[PDB]
């Protein structure tokens, strides 16, 4: 130390290379949102499991052709019919009802005309079939949608609502998935008070813990608030030991610049015996960002020591922490989604790659969204929550500034 | 009935026009994610509340200019200094520390050279200042970032992690927000079994409840599972009455096509005394979709009767239900985000506007994402969860088909 400047590219790959994938657990399928399957899932039944009508109408014998027919009964959803349709007969069917024995096609009600009904009008007795049915018409045969023994979901699938619905369909209500990481967050600094506190001389409220915890919670991971820790080695070691005991990932903010600090980087190295992989990153903001791993008893803990600056802490959380968490919970390609957008304002480039929260908006019929950096002046736009992180290239002897309208990379960090 | 075909545009505006905005409640700021503020929030303190150093270095008198200086002490984060810097003196400062009386500028450590330190090396005693400081240099004056009395968040703001961090910063830990809707979901149909059940003759498992509940939960709203209800008027009325009692929004699936059904539309009208605003929509899938409101005791309940077809139920939930829920929880412009994408395959157009789940992907440096419809054939792509809903125009005497590469509208429905 001062630790080497690590390039942004190397820092990012290092995080993903060194981060473990968590082990597996069995869950109820209803709790599956955002989980990654650690097993293939097979169907144990056909869908449909009986031949089913696609339409409201009549189950017919195609070989009878068009003509006038006696209605012998009705096949209704949920009940296996017991009658057999004979020549000159049909059975009323509704969508989803089983096709009765004897019938080999369905004719939809619009292709029929009713001839006779009961005196009280509640039962149809005779119908005119106006068309020549093709065999199998408007019937879903057994297993048309899913066959018994078919693999319907592969291991590695990241589940959303439709996958949960598919598990329900096939009756696989307990599934093996990767665990979610438990993430502990602490803040360090003698100037910090809790949000609930009135100010005292020399002090400010801690906002990083809240911002970071919210960011992690937004992605669905369980969290632990480890509070504010004093900037001294003893208290820091104790807090880190608690985090290691209680969590898979520890995030700290503060204590990583040069000066009064570097207690933190020193404590990680000498007292905790952690391996610090990088301690400075060539990026703006985020220069003092630190990443370490600790191996205990065949388990790898990961530690992120983020800058105390509140803006820097939230940018680095989205760039480094979130992808790591995604890898830990089993997502095969944990990289963030990066989209192309048009800059709303001119921006000056820095020798470091630069990152800034922004709002992405689509304008009428224009194919690319516009990216407007936050914090810098309309009323409505100044109220929206950031959903992007602008990713600006470092300046070069040639490119020193980017202009309004130019296409840039933006990392998605909020629901769009 | 058969109810008039309502255009997709009219159906959508009707839903948003008729849906109420819920009342307000006070919450702890930590629970604020996704909430909409129903109050303006003001700062009661300045940030910083004392003049603060931007840098590690020395607090100086600019009028002394460059030269050799006695270091009289250190100002550290969290402690108000008690000494006054006199001519020819400086005080060590770290980033965030208060500027002592007497000093009017900070010179960063890189613009200095140390002359003398204590015998044990732990305390700096004399330093050479190499530059002419400008008055106020590297100091954040009181209120530079936030002024006492400043409105930092406006009513109508939809909160994310950064807004939660801002509440923590200003110490406003309880805030008035709109309530979230409680959404009850039931399925109807005599053919339906619970996911936990083995199949019986004539029956299939209910997947809609699971898919719909997951979709609603993904957006963060509380839900109630009302189970499977028999397709008969008595049981339907009882279930609806339970939903009305327990929830703000009731979603049913099944019972809305012509035939064995229309018990549901009849029960809503005659027994529940609800106002059905539309009962068919000119769309594919989703034709039988029904929307109703019920006013009791100055409270408006909303009821969506979605198609029983599992694909139709999930498309209609994203098009109609989600925007309604967004309006109920106070979001000022509850419309979904619609983006432009390139079709991955040729598609035939229908006389109805058509909607289909898809996966959006960005390719290397290409500015527009590609949209690939689900369900229709690579391995990896067939595993991803849908994040889009393709919105296809109705066919016209001129446009009958859309080709691979053509730009189409896609509604975002998943984290991208």
JSON list of N, CA, C and O in Angstrom, two decimals, chain A residues 29-30 45 56 78 162-163 165 168-169 195-196 202-203 205 207 210-211 258 260 337 340 357 365 367-368 385 416, chain B residues 29-30 45 56 78 162-163 165 168-169 195-196 202-203 205 207 210-211 258 337 340 357 365 367-368 385 416:
[
{"chain": "A", "resi": 29, "resn": "UNK", "atom": "N", "xyz": [-42.30, -24.43, -4.04]},
{"chain": "A", "resi": 29, "resn": "UNK", "atom": "CA", "xyz": [-42.25, -23.77, -5.34]},
{"chain": "A", "resi": 29, "resn": "UNK", "atom": "C", "xyz": [-42.79, -22.32, -5.26]},
{"chain": "A", "resi": 29, "resn": "UNK", "atom": "O", "xyz": [-42.39, -21.46, -6.06]},
{"chain": "A", "resi": 30, "resn": "UNK", "atom": "N", "xyz": [-43.66, -22.03, -4.30]},
{"chain": "A", "resi": 30, "resn": "UNK", "atom": "CA", "xyz": [-44.23, -20.69, -4.18]},
{"chain": "A", "resi": 30, "resn": "UNK", "atom": "C", "xyz": [-43.18, -19.65, -3.80]},
{"chain": "A", "resi": 30, "resn": "UNK", "atom": "O", "xyz": [-43.39, -18.44, -4.01]},
{"chain": "A", "resi": 45, "resn": "UNK", "atom": "N", "xyz": [-47.13, -36.46, -15.41]},
{"chain": "A", "resi": 45, "resn": "UNK", "atom": "CA", "xyz": [-48.43, -36.66, -16.07]},
{"chain": "A", "resi": 45, "resn": "UNK", "atom": "C", "xyz": [-48.41, -35.97, -17.43]},
{"chain": "A", "resi": 45, "resn": "UNK", "atom": "O", "xyz": [-47.66, -35.05, -17.65]},
{"chain": "A", "resi": 56, "resn": "UNK", "atom": "N", "xyz": [-66.33, -24.58, -27.16]},
{"chain": "A", "resi": 56, "resn": "UNK", "atom": "CA", "xyz": [-67.72, -24.80, -26.81]},
{"chain": "A", "resi": 56, "resn": "UNK", "atom": "C", "xyz": [-68.43, -25.27, -28.08]},
{"chain": "A", "resi": 56, "resn": "UNK", "atom": "O", "xyz": [-68.36, -24.63, -29.13]},
{"chain": "A", "resi": 78, "resn": "UNK", "atom": "N", "xyz": [-64.22, -31.23, -15.72]},
{"chain": "A", "resi": 78, "resn": "UNK", "atom": "CA", "xyz": [-64.03, -31.82, -14.41]},
{"chain": "A", "resi": 78, "resn": "UNK", "atom": "C", "xyz": [-64.68, -33.17, -14.20]},
{"chain": "A", "resi": 78, "resn": "UNK", "atom": "O", "xyz": [-64.48, -33.80, -13.16]},
{"chain": "A", "resi": 162, "resn": "UNK", "atom": "N", "xyz": [-43.91, -17.31, -14.68]},
{"chain": "A", "resi": 162, "resn": "UNK", "atom": "CA", "xyz": [-44.30, -18.38, -15.59]},
{"chain": "A", "resi": 162, "resn": "UNK", "atom": "C", "xyz": [-43.69, -19.74, -15.23]},
{"chain": "A", "resi": 162, "resn": "UNK", "atom": "O", "xyz": [-44.33, -20.79, -15.38]},
{"chain": "A", "resi": 163, "resn": "UNK", "atom": "N", "xyz": [-42.45, -19.74, -14.74]},
{"chain": "A", "resi": 163, "resn": "UNK", "atom": "CA", "xyz": [-41.83, -20.96, -14.28]},
{"chain": "A", "resi": 163, "resn": "UNK", "atom": "C", "xyz": [-42.49, -21.51, -13.00]},
{"chain": "A", "resi": 163, "resn": "UNK", "atom": "O", "xyz": [-42.71, -22.70, -12.83]},
{"chain": "A", "resi": 165, "resn": "UNK", "atom": "N", "xyz": [-45.66, -21.07, -12.33]},
{"chain": "A", "resi": 165, "resn": "UNK", "atom": "CA", "xyz": [-46.89, -21.64, -12.88]},
{"chain": "A", "resi": 165, "resn": "UNK", "atom": "C", "xyz": [-46.68, -23.02, -13.51]},
{"chain": "A", "resi": 165, "resn": "UNK", "atom": "O", "xyz": [-47.55, -23.90, -13.43]},
{"chain": "A", "resi": 168, "resn": "UNK", "atom": "N", "xyz": [-46.38, -25.58, -10.82]},
{"chain": "A", "resi": 168, "resn": "UNK", "atom": "CA", "xyz": [-47.70, -25.88, -10.32]},
{"chain": "A", "resi": 168, "resn": "UNK", "atom": "C", "xyz": [-48.41, -26.84, -11.27]},
{"chain": "A", "resi": 168, "resn": "UNK", "atom": "O", "xyz": [-49.05, -27.80, -10.83]},
{"chain": "A", "resi": 169, "resn": "UNK", "atom": "N", "xyz": [-48.28, -26.59, -12.57]},
{"chain": "A", "resi": 169, "resn": "UNK", "atom": "CA", "xyz": [-48.91, -27.43, -13.61]},
{"chain": "A", "resi": 169, "resn": "UNK", "atom": "C", "xyz": [-48.50, -28.89, -13.49]},
{"chain": "A", "resi": 169, "resn": "UNK", "atom": "O", "xyz": [-49.35, -29.80, -13.59]},
{"chain": "A", "resi": 195, "resn": "UNK", "atom": "N", "xyz": [-29.71, 7.38, 11.69]},
{"chain": "A", "resi": 195, "resn": "UNK", "atom": "CA", "xyz": [-30.80, 8.23, 11.14]},
{"chain": "A", "resi": 195, "resn": "UNK", "atom": "C", "xyz": [-31.78, 8.77, 12.17]},
{"chain": "A", "resi": 195, "resn": "UNK", "atom": "O", "xyz": [-32.28, 9.91, 12.06]},
{"chain": "A", "resi": 196, "resn": "UNK", "atom": "N", "xyz": [-32.07, 7.96, 13.20]},
{"chain": "A", "resi": 196, "resn": "UNK", "atom": "CA", "xyz": [-32.99, 8.36, 14.27]},
{"chain": "A", "resi": 196, "resn": "UNK", "atom": "C", "xyz": [-32.46, 9.44, 15.20]},
{"chain": "A", "resi": 196, "resn": "UNK", "atom": "O", "xyz": [-33.21, 9.98, 16.01]},
{"chain": "A", "resi": 202, "resn": "UNK", "atom": "N", "xyz": [-19.94, 18.10, 15.25]},
{"chain": "A", "resi": 202, "resn": "UNK", "atom": "CA", "xyz": [-18.99, 17.30, 14.49]},
{"chain": "A", "resi": 202, "resn": "UNK", "atom": "C", "xyz": [-19.56, 16.10, 13.78]},
{"chain": "A", "resi": 202, "resn": "UNK", "atom": "O", "xyz": [-18.81, 15.39, 13.13]},
{"chain": "A", "resi": 203, "resn": "UNK", "atom": "N", "xyz": [-20.87, 15.86, 13.89]},
{"chain": "A", "resi": 203, "resn": "UNK", "atom": "CA", "xyz": [-21.45, 14.61, 13.40]},
{"chain": "A", "resi": 203, "resn": "UNK", "atom": "C", "xyz": [-22.46, 14.82, 12.29]},
{"chain": "A", "resi": 203, "resn": "UNK", "atom": "O", "xyz": [-23.05, 15.90, 12.16]},
{"chain": "A", "resi": 205, "resn": "UNK", "atom": "N", "xyz": [-25.58, 12.25, 9.95]},
{"chain": "A", "resi": 205, "resn": "UNK", "atom": "CA", "xyz": [-26.25, 10.97, 9.88]},
{"chain": "A", "resi": 205, "resn": "UNK", "atom": "C", "xyz": [-25.68, 10.00, 8.83]},
{"chain": "A", "resi": 205, "resn": "UNK", "atom": "O", "xyz": [-25.28, 10.39, 7.75]},
{"chain": "A", "resi": 207, "resn": "UNK", "atom": "N", "xyz": [-26.07, 7.57, 6.04]},
{"chain": "A", "resi": 207, "resn": "UNK", "atom": "CA", "xyz": [-27.03, 7.23, 4.99]},
{"chain": "A", "resi": 207, "resn": "UNK", "atom": "C", "xyz": [-26.62, 6.00, 4.20]},
{"chain": "A", "resi": 207, "resn": "UNK", "atom": "O", "xyz": [-27.45, 5.36, 3.57]},
{"chain": "A", "resi": 210, "resn": "UNK", "atom": "N", "xyz": [-28.39, 2.56, 5.06]},
{"chain": "A", "resi": 210, "resn": "UNK", "atom": "CA", "xyz": [-29.75, 2.54, 4.52]},
{"chain": "A", "resi": 210, "resn": "UNK", "atom": "C", "xyz": [-29.81, 2.36, 3.00]},
{"chain": "A", "resi": 210, "resn": "UNK", "atom": "O", "xyz": [-30.62, 1.58, 2.51]},
{"chain": "A", "resi": 211, "resn": "UNK", "atom": "N", "xyz": [-28.98, 3.09, 2.27]},
{"chain": "A", "resi": 211, "resn": "UNK", "atom": "CA", "xyz": [-28.98, 3.04, 0.82]},
{"chain": "A", "resi": 211, "resn": "UNK", "atom": "C", "xyz": [-28.53, 1.65, 0.35]},
{"chain": "A", "resi": 211, "resn": "UNK", "atom": "O", "xyz": [-29.12, 1.06, -0.56]},
{"chain": "A", "resi": 258, "resn": "UNK", "atom": "N", "xyz": [-6.69, 6.99, 2.31]},
{"chain": "A", "resi": 258, "resn": "UNK", "atom": "CA", "xyz": [-5.44, 7.14, 3.06]},
{"chain": "A", "resi": 258, "resn": "UNK", "atom": "C", "xyz": [-5.64, 8.17, 4.17]},
{"chain": "A", "resi": 258, "resn": "UNK", "atom": "O", "xyz": [-6.36, 9.15, 3.99]},
{"chain": "A", "resi": 260, "resn": "UNK", "atom": "N", "xyz": [-6.29, 8.76, 8.58]},
{"chain": "A", "resi": 260, "resn": "UNK", "atom": "CA", "xyz": [-6.92, 8.17, 9.77]},
{"chain": "A", "resi": 260, "resn": "UNK", "atom": "C", "xyz": [-7.40, 6.73, 9.58]},
{"chain": "A", "resi": 260, "resn": "UNK", "atom": "O", "xyz": [-7.61, 6.00, 10.55]},
{"chain": "A", "resi": 337, "resn": "UNK", "atom": "N", "xyz": [-27.24, -5.99, -17.14]},
{"chain": "A", "resi": 337, "resn": "UNK", "atom": "CA", "xyz": [-27.76, -5.62, -18.45]},
{"chain": "A", "resi": 337, "resn": "UNK", "atom": "C", "xyz": [-27.31, -4.21, -18.79]},
{"chain": "A", "resi": 337, "resn": "UNK", "atom": "O", "xyz": [-27.51, -3.26, -17.99]},
{"chain": "A", "resi": 340, "resn": "UNK", "atom": "N", "xyz": [-27.99, 0.71, -24.73]},
{"chain": "A", "resi": 340, "resn": "UNK", "atom": "CA", "xyz": [-27.57, 1.92, -25.42]},
{"chain": "A", "resi": 340, "resn": "UNK", "atom": "C", "xyz": [-28.61, 3.02, -25.27]},
{"chain": "A", "resi": 340, "resn": "UNK", "atom": "O", "xyz": [-29.80, 2.80, -25.48]},
{"chain": "A", "resi": 357, "resn": "UNK", "atom": "N", "xyz": [-25.44, 8.05, -11.82]},
{"chain": "A", "resi": 357, "resn": "UNK", "atom": "CA", "xyz": [-26.84, 7.64, -11.80]},
{"chain": "A", "resi": 357, "resn": "UNK", "atom": "C", "xyz": [-27.58, 8.45, -12.84]},
{"chain": "A", "resi": 357, "resn": "UNK", "atom": "O", "xyz": [-27.25, 9.61, -13.05]},
{"chain": "A", "resi": 365, "resn": "UNK", "atom": "N", "xyz": [-41.87, 7.83, -30.51]},
{"chain": "A", "resi": 365, "resn": "UNK", "atom": "CA", "xyz": [-41.57, 6.70, -31.39]},
{"chain": "A", "resi": 365, "resn": "UNK", "atom": "C", "xyz": [-40.07, 6.53, -31.63]},
{"chain": "A", "resi": 365, "resn": "UNK", "atom": "O", "xyz": [-39.65, 5.74, -32.46]},
{"chain": "A", "resi": 367, "resn": "UNK", "atom": "N", "xyz": [-36.47, 5.19, -31.35]},
{"chain": "A", "resi": 367, "resn": "UNK", "atom": "CA", "xyz": [-36.02, 3.84, -30.99]},
{"chain": "A", "resi": 367, "resn": "UNK", "atom": "C", "xyz": [-35.09, 3.78, -29.78]},
{"chain": "A", "resi": 367, "resn": "UNK", "atom": "O", "xyz": [-35.14, 2.80, -29.04]},
{"chain": "A", "resi": 368, "resn": "UNK", "atom": "N", "xyz": [-34.24, 4.77, -29.55]},
{"chain": "A", "resi": 368, "resn": "UNK", "atom": "CA", "xyz": [-33.36, 4.71, -28.39]},
{"chain": "A", "resi": 368, "resn": "UNK", "atom": "C", "xyz": [-33.84, 5.59, -27.24]},
{"chain": "A", "resi": 368, "resn": "UNK", "atom": "O", "xyz": [-34.32, 6.70, -27.47]},
{"chain": "A", "resi": 385, "resn": "UNK", "atom": "N", "xyz": [-36.96, 8.26, -9.77]},
{"chain": "A", "resi": 385, "resn": "UNK", "atom": "CA", "xyz": [-35.88, 7.46, -9.16]},
{"chain": "A", "resi": 385, "resn": "UNK", "atom": "C", "xyz": [-34.94, 6.94, -10.23]},
{"chain": "A", "resi": 385, "resn": "UNK", "atom": "O", "xyz": [-35.38, 6.56, -11.31]},
{"chain": "A", "resi": 416, "resn": "UNK", "atom": "N", "xyz": [-37.28, -0.47, -15.17]},
{"chain": "A", "resi": 416, "resn": "UNK", "atom": "CA", "xyz": [-37.32, 0.61, -16.15]},
{"chain": "A", "resi": 416, "resn": "UNK", "atom": "C", "xyz": [-38.65, 1.38, -16.14]},
{"chain": "A", "resi": 416, "resn": "UNK", "atom": "O", "xyz": [-38.69, 2.58, -16.43]},
{"chain": "B", "resi": 29, "resn": "UNK", "atom": "N", "xyz": [-39.15, 4.80, 7.37]},
{"chain": "B", "resi": 29, "resn": "UNK", "atom": "CA", "xyz": [-38.51, 5.08, 6.09]},
{"chain": "B", "resi": 29, "resn": "UNK", "atom": "C", "xyz": [-37.84, 3.81, 5.50]},
{"chain": "B", "resi": 29, "resn": "UNK", "atom": "O", "xyz": [-37.71, 3.69, 4.28]},
{"chain": "B", "resi": 30, "resn": "UNK", "atom": "N", "xyz": [-37.45, 2.86, 6.35]},
{"chain": "B", "resi": 30, "resn": "UNK", "atom": "CA", "xyz": [-36.79, 1.66, 5.87]},
{"chain": "B", "resi": 30, "resn": "UNK", "atom": "C", "xyz": [-37.72, 0.77, 5.04]},
{"chain": "B", "resi": 30, "resn": "UNK", "atom": "O", "xyz": [-37.25, -0.07, 4.27]},
{"chain": "B", "resi": 45, "resn": "UNK", "atom": "N", "xyz": [-31.80, 20.29, 9.18]},
{"chain": "B", "resi": 45, "resn": "UNK", "atom": "CA", "xyz": [-30.39, 20.64, 9.44]},
{"chain": "B", "resi": 45, "resn": "UNK", "atom": "C", "xyz": [-29.70, 20.93, 8.11]},
{"chain": "B", "resi": 45, "resn": "UNK", "atom": "O", "xyz": [-30.12, 20.45, 7.07]},
{"chain": "B", "resi": 56, "resn": "UNK", "atom": "N", "xyz": [-7.76, 15.03, 2.65]},
{"chain": "B", "resi": 56, "resn": "UNK", "atom": "CA", "xyz": [-6.72, 14.77, 3.63]},
{"chain": "B", "resi": 56, "resn": "UNK", "atom": "C", "xyz": [-5.61, 15.79, 3.38]},
{"chain": "B", "resi": 56, "resn": "UNK", "atom": "O", "xyz": [-5.11, 15.94, 2.27]},
{"chain": "B", "resi": 78, "resn": "UNK", "atom": "N", "xyz": [-15.72, 13.67, 13.35]},
{"chain": "B", "resi": 78, "resn": "UNK", "atom": "CA", "xyz": [-16.55, 13.37, 14.49]},
{"chain": "B", "resi": 78, "resn": "UNK", "atom": "C", "xyz": [-16.29, 14.20, 15.73]},
{"chain": "B", "resi": 78, "resn": "UNK", "atom": "O", "xyz": [-17.03, 14.09, 16.71]},
{"chain": "B", "resi": 162, "resn": "UNK", "atom": "N", "xyz": [-31.91, 5.40, -3.29]},
{"chain": "B", "resi": 162, "resn": "UNK", "atom": "CA", "xyz": [-31.34, 6.72, -3.08]},
{"chain": "B", "resi": 162, "resn": "UNK", "atom": "C", "xyz": [-32.25, 7.66, -2.29]},
{"chain": "B", "resi": 162, "resn": "UNK", "atom": "O", "xyz": [-31.78, 8.47, -1.48]},
{"chain": "B", "resi": 163, "resn": "UNK", "atom": "N", "xyz": [-33.56, 7.56, -2.51]},
{"chain": "B", "resi": 163, "resn": "UNK", "atom": "CA", "xyz": [-34.51, 8.34, -1.74]},
{"chain": "B", "resi": 163, "resn": "UNK", "atom": "C", "xyz": [-34.57, 7.89, -0.27]},
{"chain": "B", "resi": 163, "resn": "UNK", "atom": "O", "xyz": [-34.65, 8.69, 0.66]},
{"chain": "B", "resi": 165, "resn": "UNK", "atom": "N", "xyz": [-32.00, 6.64, 1.31]},
{"chain": "B", "resi": 165, "resn": "UNK", "atom": "CA", "xyz": [-30.76, 7.22, 1.83]},
{"chain": "B", "resi": 165, "resn": "UNK", "atom": "C", "xyz": [-30.89, 8.71, 2.15]},
{"chain": "B", "resi": 165, "resn": "UNK", "atom": "O", "xyz": [-30.30, 9.21, 3.12]},
{"chain": "B", "resi": 168, "resn": "UNK", "atom": "N", "xyz": [-32.75, 9.14, 5.35]},
{"chain": "B", "resi": 168, "resn": "UNK", "atom": "CA", "xyz": [-31.85, 8.86, 6.45]},
{"chain": "B", "resi": 168, "resn": "UNK", "atom": "C", "xyz": [-30.95, 10.07, 6.71]},
{"chain": "B", "resi": 168, "resn": "UNK", "atom": "O", "xyz": [-30.74, 10.46, 7.85]},
{"chain": "B", "resi": 169, "resn": "UNK", "atom": "N", "xyz": [-30.45, 10.68, 5.63]},
{"chain": "B", "resi": 169, "resn": "UNK", "atom": "CA", "xyz": [-29.58, 11.86, 5.72]},
{"chain": "B", "resi": 169, "resn": "UNK", "atom": "C", "xyz": [-30.22, 13.00, 6.50]},
{"chain": "B", "resi": 169, "resn": "UNK", "atom": "O", "xyz": [-29.58, 13.64, 7.36]},
{"chain": "B", "resi": 195, "resn": "UNK", "atom": "N", "xyz": [-52.13, -27.54, -6.88]},
{"chain": "B", "resi": 195, "resn": "UNK", "atom": "CA", "xyz": [-50.79, -28.05, -7.28]},
{"chain": "B", "resi": 195, "resn": "UNK", "atom": "C", "xyz": [-50.29, -29.25, -6.48]},
{"chain": "B", "resi": 195, "resn": "UNK", "atom": "O", "xyz": [-49.61, -30.15, -7.03]},
{"chain": "B", "resi": 196, "resn": "UNK", "atom": "N", "xyz": [-50.61, -29.29, -5.18]},
{"chain": "B", "resi": 196, "resn": "UNK", "atom": "CA", "xyz": [-50.21, -30.38, -4.31]},
{"chain": "B", "resi": 196, "resn": "UNK", "atom": "C", "xyz": [-50.91, -31.71, -4.57]},
{"chain": "B", "resi": 196, "resn": "UNK", "atom": "O", "xyz": [-50.53, -32.74, -4.03]},
{"chain": "B", "resi": 202, "resn": "UNK", "atom": "N", "xyz": [-60.62, -36.51, -15.27]},
{"chain": "B", "resi": 202, "resn": "UNK", "atom": "CA", "xyz": [-61.26, -35.28, -15.71]},
{"chain": "B", "resi": 202, "resn": "UNK", "atom": "C", "xyz": [-60.63, -34.01, -15.21]},
{"chain": "B", "resi": 202, "resn": "UNK", "atom": "O", "xyz": [-61.12, -32.94, -15.54]},
{"chain": "B", "resi": 203, "resn": "UNK", "atom": "N", "xyz": [-59.56, -34.10, -14.41]},
{"chain": "B", "resi": 203, "resn": "UNK", "atom": "CA", "xyz": [-59.03, -32.91, -13.73]},
{"chain": "B", "resi": 203, "resn": "UNK", "atom": "C", "xyz": [-57.62, -32.56, -14.15]},
{"chain": "B", "resi": 203, "resn": "UNK", "atom": "O", "xyz": [-56.87, -33.43, -14.63]},
{"chain": "B", "resi": 205, "resn": "UNK", "atom": "N", "xyz": [-54.24, -29.64, -12.79]},
{"chain": "B", "resi": 205, "resn": "UNK", "atom": "CA", "xyz": [-53.82, -28.71, -11.77]},
{"chain": "B", "resi": 205, "resn": "UNK", "atom": "C", "xyz": [-54.02, -27.23, -12.14]},
{"chain": "B", "resi": 205, "resn": "UNK", "atom": "O", "xyz": [-53.83, -26.81, -13.26]},
{"chain": "B", "resi": 207, "resn": "UNK", "atom": "N", "xyz": [-52.83, -23.71, -12.35]},
{"chain": "B", "resi": 207, "resn": "UNK", "atom": "CA", "xyz": [-51.57, -22.96, -12.42]},
{"chain": "B", "resi": 207, "resn": "UNK", "atom": "C", "xyz": [-51.79, -21.46, -12.38]},
{"chain": "B", "resi": 207, "resn": "UNK", "atom": "O", "xyz": [-50.87, -20.71, -12.05]},
{"chain": "B", "resi": 210, "resn": "UNK", "atom": "N", "xyz": [-51.15, -19.56, -8.96]},
{"chain": "B", "resi": 210, "resn": "UNK", "atom": "CA", "xyz": [-49.71, -19.45, -8.72]},
{"chain": "B", "resi": 210, "resn": "UNK", "atom": "C", "xyz": [-49.02, -18.40, -9.59]},
{"chain": "B", "resi": 210, "resn": "UNK", "atom": "O", "xyz": [-48.21, -17.62, -9.09]},
{"chain": "B", "resi": 211, "resn": "UNK", "atom": "N", "xyz": [-49.31, -18.39, -10.88]},
{"chain": "B", "resi": 211, "resn": "UNK", "atom": "CA", "xyz": [-48.69, -17.48, -11.81]},
{"chain": "B", "resi": 211, "resn": "UNK", "atom": "C", "xyz": [-49.09, -16.04, -11.49]},
{"chain": "B", "resi": 211, "resn": "UNK", "atom": "O", "xyz": [-48.27, -15.12, -11.47]},
{"chain": "B", "resi": 258, "resn": "UNK", "atom": "N", "xyz": [-68.41, -17.92, -23.01]},
{"chain": "B", "resi": 258, "resn": "UNK", "atom": "CA", "xyz": [-69.82, -18.29, -23.15]},
{"chain": "B", "resi": 258, "resn": "UNK", "atom": "C", "xyz": [-69.97, -19.79, -22.95]},
{"chain": "B", "resi": 258, "resn": "UNK", "atom": "O", "xyz": [-69.10, -20.57, -23.34]},
{"chain": "B", "resi": 337, "resn": "UNK", "atom": "N", "xyz": [-43.76, 0.68, -19.09]},
{"chain": "B", "resi": 337, "resn": "UNK", "atom": "CA", "xyz": [-42.66, 1.10, -19.95]},
{"chain": "B", "resi": 337, "resn": "UNK", "atom": "C", "xyz": [-42.69, 0.27, -21.23]},
{"chain": "B", "resi": 337, "resn": "UNK", "atom": "O", "xyz": [-42.71, -0.98, -21.19]},
{"chain": "B", "resi": 340, "resn": "UNK", "atom": "N", "xyz": [-38.69, -0.09, -27.85]},
{"chain": "B", "resi": 340, "resn": "UNK", "atom": "CA", "xyz": [-38.57, -0.56, -29.22]},
{"chain": "B", "resi": 340, "resn": "UNK", "atom": "C", "xyz": [-37.53, -1.67, -29.33]},
{"chain": "B", "resi": 340, "resn": "UNK", "atom": "O", "xyz": [-36.42, -1.56, -28.81]},
{"chain": "B", "resi": 357, "resn": "UNK", "atom": "N", "xyz": [-45.46, -13.21, -24.80]},
{"chain": "B", "resi": 357, "resn": "UNK", "atom": "CA", "xyz": [-44.29, -13.12, -23.93]},
{"chain": "B", "resi": 357, "resn": "UNK", "atom": "C", "xyz": [-43.05, -13.25, -24.79]},
{"chain": "B", "resi": 357, "resn": "UNK", "atom": "O", "xyz": [-43.06, -13.98, -25.77]},
{"chain": "B", "resi": 365, "resn": "UNK", "atom": "N", "xyz": [-22.74, -4.39, -29.88]},
{"chain": "B", "resi": 365, "resn": "UNK", "atom": "CA", "xyz": [-22.80, -2.93, -29.92]},
{"chain": "B", "resi": 365, "resn": "UNK", "atom": "C", "xyz": [-24.05, -2.42, -30.63]},
{"chain": "B", "resi": 365, "resn": "UNK", "atom": "O", "xyz": [-24.18, -1.22, -30.89]},
{"chain": "B", "resi": 367, "resn": "UNK", "atom": "N", "xyz": [-27.57, -0.96, -31.22]},
{"chain": "B", "resi": 367, "resn": "UNK", "atom": "CA", "xyz": [-28.34, -0.05, -30.37]},
{"chain": "B", "resi": 367, "resn": "UNK", "atom": "C", "xyz": [-29.71, -0.58, -29.93]},
{"chain": "B", "resi": 367, "resn": "UNK", "atom": "O", "xyz": [-30.14, -0.27, -28.83]},
{"chain": "B", "resi": 368, "resn": "UNK", "atom": "N", "xyz": [-30.40, -1.36, -30.76]},
{"chain": "B", "resi": 368, "resn": "UNK", "atom": "CA", "xyz": [-31.70, -1.88, -30.33]},
{"chain": "B", "resi": 368, "resn": "UNK", "atom": "C", "xyz": [-31.64, -3.33, -29.89]},
{"chain": "B", "resi": 368, "resn": "UNK", "atom": "O", "xyz": [-30.93, -4.13, -30.50]},
{"chain": "B", "resi": 385, "resn": "UNK", "atom": "N", "xyz": [-36.14, -16.45, -18.50]},
{"chain": "B", "resi": 385, "resn": "UNK", "atom": "CA", "xyz": [-37.49, -16.02, -18.08]},
{"chain": "B", "resi": 385, "resn": "UNK", "atom": "C", "xyz": [-37.94, -14.82, -18.90]},
{"chain": "B", "resi": 385, "resn": "UNK", "atom": "O", "xyz": [-37.13, -13.94, -19.19]},
{"chain": "B", "resi": 416, "resn": "UNK", "atom": "N", "xyz": [-34.87, -6.41, -16.69]},
{"chain": "B", "resi": 416, "resn": "UNK", "atom": "CA", "xyz": [-34.24, -6.68, -17.97]},
{"chain": "B", "resi": 416, "resn": "UNK", "atom": "C", "xyz": [-32.94, -7.49, -17.84]},
{"chain": "B", "resi": 416, "resn": "UNK", "atom": "O", "xyz": [-32.59, -8.27, -18.74]}
]
